[PDB]
Amino acid sequence: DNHLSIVTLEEAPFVIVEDIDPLTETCVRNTVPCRKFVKINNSTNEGMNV
C-alpha cells in the first residue's frame, strides 16, 4: 500500500493550485502534480482527468 489517495478542496488560502504553463514541461519546479474533474455540460457528468 504505497499510493495513498488524498482528497483536497480549494476554498481557503492553503491550496493555490492553478493551471499549468504550456511550455513542453509538466509545471513549475518543486511541485507535486494533482488532478481534478472538469464538467463539460450541466447534464453530462463526464469529466476528463486534467
Add this chain to the structure above:
Amino acid sequence: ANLAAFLVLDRPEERITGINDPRLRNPSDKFIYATVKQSSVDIYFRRQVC
C-alpha cells in the same frame, strides 16, 4: 496643533529598502508595480511560491 500634526504626517511615502519591505509584500491599487513580460525576473518570480 492641527498644523503641527499635518506637518509631521506630511511625509508622502518612505523609500522601499528592498524586497522585504511590507509595502511591496501586499500590493494595492494605490501603489502599483509590475515587470515587463518574461524577464529573467519573471522566471525567478515563478519559482518563488511565497
